[PDB]
Design a protein around this ligand. Structure first.
Ligand SMILES: *[C@@H]1O[C@H](CO)[C@@H](O[C@@H]2O[C@H](CO)[C@@H](O[C@@H]3O[C@H](CO[C@H]4O[C@H](CO[C@H]5O[C@H](CO)[C@@H](O)[C@H](O)[C@@H]5O[C@H]5O[C@H](CO)[C@@H](O)[C@H](O)[C@@H]5O)[C@@H](O)[C@H](O[C@H]5O[C@H](CO)[C@@H](O)[C@H](O)[C@@H]5O)[C@@H]4O)[C@@H](O)[C@H](O[C@H]4O[C@H](CO)[C@@H](O)[C@H](O)[C@@H]4O[C@H]4O[C@H](CO)[C@@H](O)[C@H](O)[C@@H]4O[C@H]4O[C@H](CO)[C@@H](O)[C@H](O)[C@@H]4O)[C@@H]3O)[C@H](O)[C@H]2NC(C)=O)[C@H](O)[C@H]1NC(C)=O
Ligand SMILES: *[C@@H]1O[C@H](CO)[C@@H](O[C@@H]2O[C@H](CO)[C@@H](O[C@@H]3O[C@H](CO[C@H]4O[C@H](CO[C@H]5O[C@H](CO)[C@@H](O)[C@H](O)[C@@H]5O[C@H]5O[C@H](CO)[C@@H](O)[C@H](O)[C@@H]5O)[C@@H](O)[C@H](O[C@H]5O[C@H](CO)[C@@H](O)[C@H](O)[C@@H]5O)[C@@H]4O)[C@@H](O)[C@H](O[C@H]4O[C@H](CO)[C@@H](O)[C@H](O)[C@@H]4O[C@H]4O[C@H](CO)[C@@H](O)[C@H](O)[C@@H]4O[C@H]4O[C@H](CO)[C@@H](O)[C@H](O)[C@@H]4O)[C@@H]3O)[C@H](O)[C@H]2NC(C)=O)[C@H](O)[C@H]1NC(C)=O
Ligand code: HEM
Ligand code: HEM
Ligand SMILES: *[C@@H]1O[C@H](CO)[C@@H](O)[C@H](O)[C@H]1NC(C)=O
Ligand SMILES: *[C@@H]1O[C@H](CO)[C@@H](O)[C@H](O)[C@H]1NC(C)=O
Ligand SMILES: *[C@@H]1O[C@H](CO)[C@@H](O)[C@H](O)[C@H]1NC(C)=O
Ligand SMILES: *[C@@H]1O[C@H](CO)[C@@H](O)[C@H](O)[C@H]1NC(C)=O
Ligand code: NA
Lengths: 272, 37, 291, 48, 28, 97, 272
């Protein structure tokens, strides 16, 4: 239908989650669906065990990738009244949240209610300090864009020249944690490849190495983010306290699972 | 006066769509003819 | 012995299990291939449904552009990688390796047809989508088209868009797509089972049009009307592998021999005894090719 | 019963060229026989 | 009522001018 | 040594090099509270709306992190370190008593 | 040595030519040097012919690549007196040159003498209209940088919204000429590969195809750059006229050489 403009005047949809996590979930769910489809082709009573193995493997892989790309390592959230925009003395009541990941920081500003001052307050901004990316340039672009005051404040808190040294320590921690997680993912790939080979011992040792590298990434992130001097984040009349987020605990449980699986495989081989 | 952009083009657009849809029919006719010979 | 089973329950599940146990490799390979195709389709669909608002393309065409772009990505991938099914030497080398326990190479030719049978379908959707787009582009004002295609239109106030035939025949993607549709119709009709039974020379005469098909696919997206051309990226490695396999096949010299005896054995079997080449040495279980 | 017909055999090769289910059954039988450590049955997937 | 009834001046000098946000700002 | 300059200038004759001001050009008490919000937070005690002070309430907290106060060594005695440098809005506030 | 700053106070050198052309020349000269080193290893009297073939092949390849990356397709040059910079009424005497290539335009402004008004005038600026590159953005960045007036004038002449349509036609011509030249380079690679194979006929036909594609690139560039309406380039008291540059004639001679070589190879095979 024509004769009117625009042809599609409806609001343009927004993706309801992170695209990298969604893509990882979709790929691994497709693999799981294919394996479930071929499951009756797995002959004998082994299939159950097979199913478990397959699921475990996929989960591990997915977890690693998700944990490498999720900004859920250092999370914090407060409910505050704060100034919203320039040339306006009105304040907004909103939840302000910090989500520090390996490659950057996601600052969330969700209005309570979302519709305040005739504006939609559901900001989720990203500021990346990955190698080759200039954090100061991104903060300057955010300033020129005119982001709300809490977002600009939390972004300036992580600038390289800010008085509190969160930028350097967090960048180092995220970089080396991501490197260790990539090593763990490569070890997971090698373990999956070598478990099909007749030598199951090397596959078990590779799975144990995957768990070890996940735990090493955890330890490096903790040690590098703990050495920072206390940086007080004060918004409105409240203070934002950060803590290890869901990504940290997912990495912990996945690394422990891999370590235990490799140890059990080695012990079972030694005993049998 | 309301300006219509597609005036005088509906018949020709339909003819173009028909030719695009008849491409397989033309190929099938040619295949039948060459199979006969 | 043979035990009794349910007339409508046990037989069905037993046949299902037999089919999966026999064709698990085929199911896995087809699932991976269609998963890659669907992933490319979904990537383009997501980009044009959630991450293309700054261009305003969906304000004029919301269903047509998504279908066209996703089908274009899947079509590029599948037309590029259909060549791997015809790498006779590579398939022969991989036939005896461990990969045969995961990939059924002997079904490659069948897989070939399958890929083609999918491609044309998506291709049709592709064309259909652009058809809708063209109609919308034929009823959108000059300012809208200038915003959508800055390098193609300039808003000088004339306010009258280009006609449908300008898109279909005075535009490089349009003409290339029309000729590609004609070539695909010819190839698919002549390569069908019916006309392959009817004739052999016509089958290959039409099937050699894939060279022109790939040339017009390279030309088709070259203008960069909507996005950067990605078909060459998909086509690079599979074309190189196919060309290398063709060169390897040409390197071998095909002997020419005569048939000593022909027997029409029952159940539609042909027993052919033919002259052994002078230096022909082979082991048990080996196979040859004949023309 | 091959172990009883031939008493002095220590390694027996079984080569399966057929549908995947049939070869799977043959290899499963070979593994079940190999579970007892009297003689070894080595199975091969052949694709002539 | 909110004791801060005015728009708090930014420490970095940004957004002081309505149309020239970088006027008087740090680094300008 | 030459001072900081605007990165968008200093490459072509029509746009010669222009220096960049490292503090806010406004007369907005930047030498008291700092030229950034993080600087202000570093200068604040977040208690009773007072600027942070050390053991003596009449003196602000000593600069501890190296990113806060200019630490030019003492020309007379060669003393270095922020052990005796107070934290102010201006980075060079401890140039002279 | 220390105690003074900077440690190396000398002027920083500038590369005396285009880097892509220099790299291509270096690579092909290295290949030629390796072939000359192994030349005595070529047994028999064939080596001379071999040498010729090798040289020819390398030259062809180099030429194609150079012609694909050189901005020497539409060249023009005038000597004028023109305004130099803003906030200055002084004029400079300089040679202003236009070098339109496949992927963009190089504008040269060389002072005569180079040292005029206490400034060094040897500008060689590039403005690219390649796919994925925004010419308007590059022109805006040049305006913000403060480039001299002749350079800005010639760059604005090629902007997409400039009244004379040089931008669209030149962009189309360069894009499709570059595509045809890449096809010719691929055909040259295939011809070199297949000349070693026993089937010399296919190698000769591939060389003929390389020549055909070079000639097609020439024809497309000529036809697409000739359809443009006359755009008068007036600087100072003179007018800049463009003509087919050295890249065009190099493409012509290389394509003719390839066509003649393939034709001669086919004729010799037919006669022998
Ligand atoms: C960590 O953070 C990462 C970064 O956020 C995150 O990655 C991101 O994930 C999300 C999905 O999960 C994705 O990002 C989102 O994408 C949405 C869609 O993007 C397309 O559309 C936008 C919108 O463009 C329209 O509007 C602007 C003006 O706003 C116009 O200039 C445009 O021309 C266009 O206008 C047309 O369409 C309108 C639709 O109604 C019509 O009304 C209008 O008439 C026109 O027809 C485009 O801008 C995008 O293009 C940009 O990006 C691409 C690619 O990067 C560039 O190539 C291109 O040049 C552009 O730069 C794209 O086409 C976005 O809508 C969405 O943006 C919102 O969120 C971000 C982040 O918070 C804000 O910065 C942004 O301003 C938006 O916030 C406003 O709007 C929302 C509601 O949509 C409010 O809730 C919010 O509070 C805020 O409202 C305020 O402003 C409003 C006006 O803008 C105002 O109305 C309100 O009242 C209020 O004042 C978002 O960007 C994407 O996948 C990632 N993004 C990346 C990578 O950049 C990651 O997942 C996070 N990690 C985790 C673990 O969570
Ligand atoms: C088609 O065109 C293509 C583009 O030109 C071309 O590709 C290019 O090829 C050439 C080689 O053939 C290469 O480009 C050249 O590279 C040279 C070296 O580049 C490095 O150095 C420069 C200089 O930086 C110093 O100076 C600036 C200020 O000028 C400072 O800001 C810097 O901090 C630095 O200062 C230190 O060093 C000084 C040295 O004396 C000290 O004095 C000082 O105290 C400091 O210690 C850097 O800017 C470069 O970095 C930039 O680029 C990289 C990569 O792109 C970016 O990552 C980075 O962020 C920067 O953006 C790099 O590090 C350049 O010197 C040279 O530049 C001259 O030419 C261009 C083009 O004409 C002009 O735009 C530019 O302004 C320069 O022209 C001035 O200077 C020359 C003499 O050098 C004069 O002859 C000329 O008339 C003009 O003088 C005017 O300005 C002067 C001040 O600048 C003034 O003194 C004069 O009086 C007069 O007013 C050039 O860029 C490179 O390979 C390609 N470039 C690309 C791809 O961008 C292609 O080949 C062409 N095709 C064909 C077929 O020919
Ligand atoms: C655009 C669609 C298609 C393309 C690009 C394509 C491509 C190819 C190519 C490159 C070959 C190798 C020819 C050679 O090595 O000489 C081939 C062979 C073949 N194709 Fe297709 N094909 C397509 C569609 C089809 C369809 C629709 C069918 C059947 C319904 C089919 C059946 C065959 C057969 C039977 C062969 C012979 C293989 C052999 O003899 O080894 N193809 N195809
Ligand atoms: C009337 C018929 C057709 C029309 C109008 C049409 C139109 C288009 C258009 C406008 C584009 C965008 C290219 C660009 O932005 O420059 C495109 C891309 C594409 N189309 Fe078509 N098309 C048609 C038929 C076909 C056919 C028959 C095929 C395959 C055999 C096909 C496969 C593709 C592919 C692979 C691309 C992407 C090319 C690339 O990314 O390099 N289309 N089409
Ligand atoms: C924000 O303001 C509302 C309204 O005065 C109040 O009820 C709420 O407690 C305030 N929130 C905080 C964290 O002080
Ligand atoms: C703003 O919000 C109020 C209350 O939510 C509503 O009554 C009003 O219609 C909205 N719009 C304007 C322009 O005030
Ligand atoms: C430029 O000015 C000089 C000095 O007046 C003069 O000799 C020369 O002819 C002028 N060039 C042109 C092209 O008019
Ligand atoms: C400028 O050029 C003139 C003549 O070339 C020369 O005498 C003078 O020293 C140069 N420098 C200045 C600052 O005038
Ligand atoms: Na100030």
């Amino acid at each position: 239908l024509g004769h009117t403009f625009p042809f599609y005047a409806g609001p343009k949809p927004t993706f309801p989650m992170d695209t990298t996590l969604a893509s990882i979930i979709m790929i691994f769910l497709t693999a799981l669906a294919t394996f479930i489809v071929i499951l009756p082709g797995i002959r004998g009573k082994t299939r159950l065990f097979w199913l478990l193995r397959v699921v475990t493997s996929l989960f591990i892989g997915a977890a690693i990738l998700a944990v490498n790309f999720s900004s859920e390592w250092s999370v914090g959230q407060v409910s505050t009244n704060t100034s919203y925009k320039a040339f306006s003395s009105e304040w907004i009541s909103a939840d302000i949240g910090l989500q520090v990941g390996l490659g950057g920081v996601n600052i969330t500003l969700t209005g309570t209610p979302v519709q305040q001052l005739n504006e939609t307050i559901n900001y989720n901004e990203e500021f990346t300090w990955r190698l080759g990316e200039n954090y100061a340039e991104e903060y300057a672009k955010a300033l020129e864009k005119g982001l709300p005051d809490p977002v600009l404040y939390l972004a300036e808190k992580f600038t390289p020249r800010s008085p509190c040294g969160l930028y350097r320590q967090y960048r180092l921690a995220g970089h080396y944690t991501s490197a260790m997680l990539w090593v763990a993912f490569l070890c997971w790939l090698l373990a999956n490849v070598m478990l099909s080979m007749p030598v199951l011992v090397y596959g078990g040792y590779m799975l144990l190495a995957t768990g070890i590298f996940q735990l090493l990434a955890l330890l490096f992130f903790s040690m590098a983010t703990s050495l920072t001097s206390p940086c007080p984040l004060h918004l409105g009349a409240s203070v934002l306290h950060t803590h290890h987020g869901p990504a940290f605990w997912i990495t912990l449980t996945t690394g422990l699972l891999c370590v235990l699986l490799g140890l059990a495989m080695a012990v079972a081989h030694r005993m049998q | 006066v309301v300006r219509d952009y597609f005036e005088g083009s509906g018949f020709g657009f339909g003819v173009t769509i028909g030719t695009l849809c008849c491409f397989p029919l033309v190929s099938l006719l040619s295949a039948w003819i060459v199979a006969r010979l | 012995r043979e035990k009794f089973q349910r007339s409508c329950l046990h037989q069905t599940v037993q046949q299902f299990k037999r089919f999966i146990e026999n064709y698990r490799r085929h199911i896995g390979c087809v699932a991976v291939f269609y998963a890659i195709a669907g992933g490319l389709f979904l990537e383009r669909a997501y980009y044009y449904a959630f991450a293309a608002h700054h261009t305003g393309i969906t304000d004029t065409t919301r269903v047509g552009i998504i279908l066209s772009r996703g089908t274009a990505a899947s079509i590029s991938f599948m037309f590029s990688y259909i060549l791997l099914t015809m790498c006779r030497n590579l398939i022969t080398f991989l036939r005896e390796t461990f990969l045969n326990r995961y990939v059924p190479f002997d079904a490659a030719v069948d897989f070939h047809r399958l890929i083609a049978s999918t491609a044309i379908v998506l291709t049709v959707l592709h064309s259909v989508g652009h058809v809708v787009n063209v109609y919308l582009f034929s009823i959108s004002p000059l300012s809208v088209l200038s915003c959508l295609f800055p390098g193609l239109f300039h808003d000088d106030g004339s306010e009258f868009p280009q006609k449908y035939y300008w898109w279909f025949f005075q535009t490089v993607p349009g003409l290339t797509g029309v000729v590609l549709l004609l070539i695909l119709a010819i190839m698919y009709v002549f390569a069908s089972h019916h006309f392959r039974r009817r004739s052999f020379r016509g089958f290959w005469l039409t099937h050699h049009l894939y060279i022109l098909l790939y040339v017009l696919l390279i030309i088709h997206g070259s203008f960069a009307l909507i996005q950067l051309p990605r078909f060459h990226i998909f086509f690079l490695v599979p074309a190189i592998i196919y060309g290398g396999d063709k060169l390897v096949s040409l390197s071998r010299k095909k002997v020419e021999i005569s048939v000593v005896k022909a027997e029409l054995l029952p159940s539609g079997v042909t027993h052919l005894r033919f002259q052994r080449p002078q230096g022909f040495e082979y082991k048990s279980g080996q196979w040859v090719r004949i023309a | 019963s091959l172990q009883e017909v031939h008493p002095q055999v220590r390694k027996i090769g079984v080569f399966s060229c057929g549908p995947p289910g049939m070869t799977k059954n043959v290899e499963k039988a070979c593994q079940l026989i190999n579970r007892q450590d009297r003689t070894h049955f080595s199975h091969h997937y052949e694709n002539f | 009522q909110n004791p801060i009834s005015w728009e708090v001046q930014r420490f970095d000098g940004w957004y002081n001018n309505l149309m020239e946000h970088r006027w008087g700002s740090k680094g300008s | 040594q030459r001072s900081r300059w605007d990165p968008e200038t200093g490459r072509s004759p029509s746009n010669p090099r222009d220096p960049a001001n490292q503090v806010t050009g406004w007369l907005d008490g930047s030498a008291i509270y700092g030229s950034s919000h993080s600087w202000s937070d570093a200068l604040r005690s977040f208690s009773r709306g007072q600027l942070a002070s050390g053991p003596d309430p009449a003196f602000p907290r000593d600069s501890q992190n190296p990113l806060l106060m200019w630490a030019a060594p003492d020309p007379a005695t060669g003393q270095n370190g922020p052990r005796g440098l107070y934290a102010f809005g201006a980075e060079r506030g401890n140039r002279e008593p």
